[PDB]
Ligand binder design. Structure first.
Ligand SMILES: CC(C)CCC[C@@H](C)[C@H]1CC[C@H]2[C@@H]3CC=C4C[C@@H](OC(=O)CCC(=O)O)CC[C@]4(C)[C@H]3CC[C@]12C
Ligand SMILES: CC(C)CCC[C@@H](C)[C@H]1CC[C@H]2[C@@H]3CC=C4C[C@@H](OC(=O)CCC(=O)O)CC[C@]4(C)[C@H]3CC[C@]12C
Ligand SMILES: CC(C)CCC[C@@H](C)[C@H]1CC[C@H]2[C@@H]3CC=C4C[C@@H](OC(=O)CCC(=O)O)CC[C@]4(C)[C@H]3CC[C@]12C
Ligand SMILES: CC(C)CCC[C@@H](C)[C@H]1CC[C@H]2[C@@H]3CC=C4C[C@@H](OC(=O)CCC(=O)O)CC[C@]4(C)[C@H]3CC[C@]12C
Ligand SMILES: CC(C)CCC[C@@H](C)[C@H]1CC[C@H]2[C@@H]3CC=C4C[C@@H](OC(=O)CCC(=O)O)CC[C@]4(C)[C@H]3CC[C@]12C
Ligand SMILES: CC(C)CCC[C@@H](C)[C@H]1CC[C@H]2[C@@H]3CC=C4C[C@@H](OC(=O)CCC(=O)O)CC[C@]4(C)[C@H]3CC[C@]12C
Ligand SMILES: CC(C)CCC[C@@H](C)[C@H]1CC[C@H]2[C@@H]3CC=C4C[C@@H](OC(=O)CCC(=O)O)CC[C@]4(C)[C@H]3CC[C@]12C
Ligand SMILES: CC(C)CCC[C@@H](C)[C@H]1CC[C@H]2[C@@H]3CC=C4C[C@@H](OC(=O)CCC(=O)O)CC[C@]4(C)[C@H]3CC[C@]12C
Ligand SMILES: N#C/C(=C\c1cn(-c2ccccc2)c2ccccc12)C(=O)O
Ligand SMILES: N#C/C(=C\c1cn(-c2ccccc2)c2ccccc12)C(=O)O
Lengths: 703, 703
């Protein structure tokens, strides 16, 4: 049973009887002495965190991990080759520059990366963003043969990814890799669903084999849909039927694959099989002069010399590279967190930013495009038994073998087989459309974030819809705390339990006491609503009672100068039966003296303000004498709240109503001490521990 | 004294013994039957709120208010004439179009407005915004004598203000006039200080008499400063010395004016006096051919016929007109709220939006620019004794007399006297620079809002810095709740008071109980920090203990198949002294079975997990058996919080640690019922009333 016998405490009387420890909290100048104090332990702890390969490579279990890493590396390197060739088409550069995007960041991440299970390379949302930034950068260059219009796109892609890597590396150095908390899962879900719709639309010009101009920012998906479906009569039917056959086979076998996972080890590489079959039947049957199928061209065997990034492209694409860097880091951290939770090893977000930025810089210098991880390729690497990032090294070696030696193969590949392979794996992102119903019946504030993120991304493009979506998801936090359900409380069962007055049957309120509760932090978007709810909860406005009391006092003092009210020790004598109702109106520059506190020390008689005032002065009466504010769910105040609350409490104190703030911790009062809140009128003795403390104090101080 | 004797309640046992009232809360379809249910009382209540002049005009006290309204109307009409002429220069149109800006909204607001003390007209921040929007609109028009370049600016100004009035009227119709709560007072203070710096810079080309091109959006103030100070050798010294003399005299007399306010009724109109003296000495001495002073030209006597707004200017200036409408409504509501609080009458914000939008539409049709109220002119109207909006009618009649009849006067006015009069009244907005110190020592989150609003407005212009400032002040709410000071609580004095464990001396914790407190709402930017703080507060991670227990159970079950552990009713028999430490590593696709709940029903012996496990199996021990979460300051959860909290509680329950959530109201649990939160593992019986309830329940259920 609950049995408590203690004294009534008042948050000052609690601190006289219970000695505090007196903690000396930390300043700024010693925050700048814990950072600059270097040590031989601190330096080695830093340089083993900058080069994580110095810590996991000598701890390699080369009896339990090597064969699994080799098998997983081969199985992810084949997928990396095909995905690089397919994602180079979304940037509209020659396809061999896709392979450079799947080699250099995977080599840099082996040395500088902290995850063990992600596969580093291109992924289609980032490749679409890089393609849109290139189309925006070549449409803004100053002026000074379709081999030279793609030589500009390659240099623009290289410059965009060098700038994105520079931004990522700078944010990793500045230790602000915690920015991934500013994206909710509803925002990520809506953004990835709309990006899957963007990817699905962008692969239509390769299936139908049409020529679509490179549209730009505001509504890119509808311009591309119009330019595709206005030329639908020029559709090459061989590419269409080949893409449909490859798409049907890869979706059927990818359903069969995960439908039967207990019986099937190292799952079926149906995309490699269909690519081999399609390139082998396009060769031999000569699907380039019988029909007019566009193929992957003759890729040159070898790497290309490094280029210097153009500062004009740096100037024209600053916000595009900011969006590319943010989306790349957010996707990589979201994918790597799954496997770090699954296998229990720590992830360093700032080291992730440093490794991805260095990989993107080295990739863009040697003419590749932007890299992060993909969820699909990382799932392929982890599903086949990847243990460390040596599987990434074997995958990069497979990409290297394809670049240097076997590049005469993949030349009869039909360029719509790649689009069909990219369309066959949009299923996981398109199945997120069944989340509007769940979030609708769950929250309705995150369903709004989902729907507005989808709409903003669709009708504003992948770079600008993300910024608008982040701003709207910041608005929804204000929407949650805008009109809080403010309550009046009452006692149940004649004990220390106080709940909502409209919720149970036999509640009891002490006479003259009001207990008000705001279940929300009070800030600038909240304080006027709080004042309105408090005023209609107590039943009156204290400013009106104060002003009418001041008007009555001015009329009483005016009648005292005329000798009409001879003041006794008790009671006014009233040596007139009735005066003829002369009300006096004050001017402006003089009305604010009605808001001053009443000091009736010149009369020996104590004016009651509640019984009856002589000579027909109405002065409306109140029954309230004590007000309790339950500030237990109020997490913070800012400035506007402290001003408005100081005004409310000053207006309540001046009409002789005691106020009590109840339910706060010591940090709340310690922050209120900085706000110039307490003075000779609002004292610190209004704070109490619990509601029952204040109620017992009221009942003791009355009688 | 505090004496309580009650049973221990558990938020389900409280609702079996206290019958709820069962309120039927309101749906959507009856929200759409309270709006469409029309009545003869509802219709008259609506149409008396659309035309407020039908309610205050027959209640006019024409014995106490008429002379004061006449005097205040004359005193504000003279100021309205001079301010209209001065603010027409910030738009760079001829000055007579300033007077039309101070006539038509003041006439429309007399019929449709709810305030009684504001003066409607131009104010310099809005006139600078209209000038910037005109300069941006004439720099974007398609192509098809300095009399024709200002005929384009007049039509662009008219179109911009018609679109701003349309936006204001549409937002007043849609009942969303509560948007003024989205601007903190720190944002308004920083914005108005930077706008005062903009106004001070924009009046330099009229004092020095220079020719400055109409610069635009990104850094307008530095381009204007460069274009002024590169031509400083061409300064007309007569305009300079006249502006300095007028500025010195008006600042000295405006200090003298409010230094002595008790002795001085109806304060000194020093601006009217200096304008009369300057125009009378510029005439007669002929300050137009002796020197080369630019003067206010010959204004044509009369109004101008209405024009149709160009839809090209509507197309080019959508965001500019949105910013103009928002700033006009915010300034007007902030000024009108002061006098509504001072004189105790209700303000309707949506009717304010409707009246201002109609006034701006009618003003822009008849070739004026945008209108709202100014704080200075409203202070002049209220200080001289304005009672109703009939003072606005007398002011508009004074402006009408100046337009129709006396326009041959104000023709020798020196056009830098007006700039000096506008510079002499920037003191109130420039004295807000002494708020970085106050907000620095008070909050440091609103000082940041002030500084970033000032910087964004200065280096981005008045339209775009406001949007960036609103986005940053939405970011600061996330900054406040990002890393909450999470605590571990303990008991003081062997009663029902639980406070921070590091704060007092003789605290007591029950053995095996941890009380954790997060003093913040938990949302998407908050849940990973909450999980990290809970894990390092309890001293371990429950996933690691669960996985190591599952590994130990798999090794025990493997040794049972070999007959090495013959299970008794109690104790393992262990018919081997020591096996040679064969640890087994699981594959991927098989590791997640370490996260499954332990069901050791196949053994009759109860496995302890805390004493000793045979054959040297370590399985790290915990002393915790009960965890209490103090969710009293947690105002809301969203989706990510419910998922992360469900994960945390499921991981704690599976290692046989009872969890208790404590301190919530019934609305919190009612919202958690929608989230698919409770199941066969996480039940609703974990919720308790207070911390002492849960602690007494723990101590009763142990022994
Ligand atoms: C929920 C709210 C925030 C949605 C707001 C949507 C607007 C941002 C969209 C809807 C209509 C769009 C417009 C629809 C059509 C066009 C014509 C289009 O014309 C072209 O130049 C086509 C391509 C070419 O030929 O170059 C340019 C974009 C534009 C102005 C669009 C700009 C973006 C707009 C205004
Ligand atoms: C998520 C959806 C429901 C939000 C609302 C969608 C609208 C903003 C979309 C739907 C139809 C779209 C239009 C569909 C087709 C076109 C034609 C397109 O034309 C061209 O690109 C070139 C035309 C030419 O050759 O002149 C320009 C965009 C536009 C107007 C689109 C503008 C954006 C619109 C109005
Ligand atoms: C904390 C992180 C986000 C810092 C990242 C900083 C970069 C975004 C900045 C720093 C240096 C900047 C560069 C400094 C100088 C120039 C040269 C400038 O060009 C010229 O002055 C002449 C050449 C021309 O534009 O024709 C174009 C912008 C650019 C590349 C700037 C682009 C933006 C850069 C890379
Ligand atoms: C959010 C925090 C990390 C600060 C980020 C700052 C950047 C957004 C700023 C800092 C340096 C700026 C650059 C400084 C100099 C230039 C050169 C400037 O060049 C010109 O004006 C060339 C002539 C012309 O464009 O007509 C164009 C803007 C730019 C790229 C600026 C773009 C915006 C930058 C990258
Ligand atoms: C705290 C952070 C967010 C501040 C970010 C500041 C930037 C938004 C500013 C700083 C430097 C500015 C630039 C400084 C100089 C110029 C050259 C200026 O050149 C002109 O065209 C001058 C006028 C003309 O001759 O037409 C155009 C604006 C620009 C690019 C400015 C664009 C806006 C910039 C990038
Ligand atoms: C609140 C402050 C401390 C924030 C940082 C200020 C900078 C963003 C400012 C300070 C100096 C400014 C510059 C001062 C002078 C000029 C020259 C000005 O030149 C012209 O307008 C035309 C030049 C020509 O004739 O070619 C263009 C803007 C610019 C570069 C300004 C760009 C913005 C700058 C770098
Ligand atoms: C809830 C509130 C914010 C609604 C406010 C809506 C306005 C901002 C919209 C509604 C109608 C729109 C107009 C509808 C049609 C046109 C014609 C359009 O021009 C043309 O189609 C041809 C002429 C040309 O531009 O050359 C230019 C934009 C404009 C004026 C639009 C400007 C923006 C307007 C006024
Ligand atoms: C925030 C809530 C209240 C919604 C606000 C919606 C507006 C921001 C949208 C709705 C209608 C839109 C307009 C619809 C049509 C047009 C015509 C369109 O004309 C052209 O594209 C002409 C050709 C060219 O510019 O090259 C330009 C955008 C504009 C003004 C749009 C601008 C953005 C507007 C005003
Ligand atoms: N990963 C993996 C596999 C196949 C592919 C997945 N996408 C993809 C498509 C859209 C979004 C994200 C990923 C491919 C793209 C081209 C060629 C092959 C694939 C596998 O072998 O299972
Ligand atoms: N109001 C009032 C008075 C004088 C003026 C105040 N500004 C002003 C200037 C900047 C910002 C806001 C206001 C004027 C402008 C032109 C001509 C006269 C005035 C008064 O007569 O006291």
């Amino acid at each position: 049973q609950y049995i408590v016998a203690r004294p009534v405490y008042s948050t000052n009387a609690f601190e006289e009887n219970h000695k505090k420890t007196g903690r000396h909290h930390k300043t700024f100048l010693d925050h700048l002495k814990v950072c600059c104090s270097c040590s031989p332990q601190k330096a080695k702890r830093i340089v083993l965190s900058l080069f994580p390969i110095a810590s996991w490579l000598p701890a390699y279990r080369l009896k339990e991990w090597l064969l699994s890493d080799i098998v997983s590396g081969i199985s992810t390197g084949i997928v990396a080759v095909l995905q690089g060739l397919a994602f180079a088409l979304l940037v509209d550069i020659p396809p061999v520059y896709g392979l450079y995007a799947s080699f250099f960041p995977a080599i840099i991440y082996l040395f500088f990366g902290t995850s063990r299970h992600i596969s580093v390379g291109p992924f289609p949302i980032l490749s679409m963003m890089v393609g849109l930034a290139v189309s925006g950068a070549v449409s803004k260059a100053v002026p000074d043969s379709l081999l030279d219009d793609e030589r500009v796109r390659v240099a623009a892609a290289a410059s965009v990814t060098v700038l994105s890597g520079i931004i990522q590396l700078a944010f990793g150095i500045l230790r602000i890799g915690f920015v991934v908390i500013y994206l909710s899962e509803s925002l990520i879900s809506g953004f990835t669903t709309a990006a899957a719709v963007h990817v699905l639309v962008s692969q239509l010009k390769f299936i139908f084999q049409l020529t679509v101009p490179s549209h730009t920012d505001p509504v890119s998906i509808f311009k591309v849909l119009y330019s595709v479906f206005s030329q639908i009569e020029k559709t090459n039917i061989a590419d269409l039927v080949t893409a449909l056959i490859v798409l049907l086979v890869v979706s059927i076998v990818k359903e069969i694959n995960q439908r039967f996972k207990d019986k099937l080890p190292v799952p079926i590489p149906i995309e490699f099989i269909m690519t081999v079959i399609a390139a082998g039947v396009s060769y031999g049957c000569d699907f380039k002069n019988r029909f007019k199928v566009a193929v992957v061209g003759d890729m040159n065997p070898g790497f290309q010399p490094p280029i210097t990034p153009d500062v004009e492209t740096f100037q024209n694409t600053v916000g595009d590279c900011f969006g590319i860097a943010m989306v790349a880091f957010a996707v990589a951290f979201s994918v790597a967190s799954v496997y770090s939770l699954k296998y229990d090893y720590p992830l360093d977000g700032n080291q992730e930013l440093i490794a991805l930025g260095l990989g993107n810089i080295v990739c863009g210098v040697f003419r590749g495009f932007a890299g992060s991880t993909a969820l699909s390729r990382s799932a392929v690497q982890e599903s086949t038994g990847g243990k460390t990032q040596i599987a990434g090294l074997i995958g990069a070696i497979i990409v290297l073998i394809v670049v240097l030696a076997i590049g005469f193969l993949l030349a009869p590949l039909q360029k719509s087989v790649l689009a069909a392979l990219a369309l066959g794996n949009l299923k996981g992102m398109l199945m997120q459309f069944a989340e509007i119903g769940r979030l609708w019946r769950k929250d309705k504030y995150d369903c709004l974030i989902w729907i507005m993120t989808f709409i903003f991304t669709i009708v504003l493009g992948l770079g600008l819809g993300l910024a608008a979506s982040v701003a709207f998801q910041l608005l929804t936090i204000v929407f949650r705390t805008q009109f809080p359900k403010c309550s009046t409380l009452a006692n149940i069962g004649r004990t220390n339990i106080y709940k909502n007055k409209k919720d149970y049957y036999d509640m009891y309120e002490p006479e003259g006491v009001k207990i008000f509760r705001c279940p929300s932090p009070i800030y600038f978007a909240n304080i006027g609503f709080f004042r309105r709810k408090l005023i209609d909860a107590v039943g009156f406005s204290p400013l009106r009672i104060l002003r009418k009391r001041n008007k009555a006092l001015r009329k009483i003092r005016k009648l005292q100068k005329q000798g009409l009210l001879q003041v006794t020790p008790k009671g006014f004598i009233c040596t007139v039966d009735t005066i003829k109702d002369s009300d006096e109106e004050l001017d402006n520059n003089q009305i604010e003296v009605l808001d001053q506190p009443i000091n009736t020390t010149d009369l020996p008689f104590h004016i009651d303000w509640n019984d009856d005032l002589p000579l027909n002065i109405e002065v409306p009466k109140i029954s309230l004498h004590s007000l309790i504010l339950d500030f237990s769910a109020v997490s913070f105040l800012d400035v506007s709240s402290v001003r408005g609350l100081k005004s409310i409490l000053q207006e309540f104190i001046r009409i002789k109503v005691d106020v009590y703030i109840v339910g706060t911790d010591d940090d709340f009062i310690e922050k209120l001490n900085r706000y110039e809140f307490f003075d000779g009128e609002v004292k610190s003795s209004i704070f109490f521990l619990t509601i029952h403390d204040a109620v017992l104090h009221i009942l003791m101080k009355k009688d």
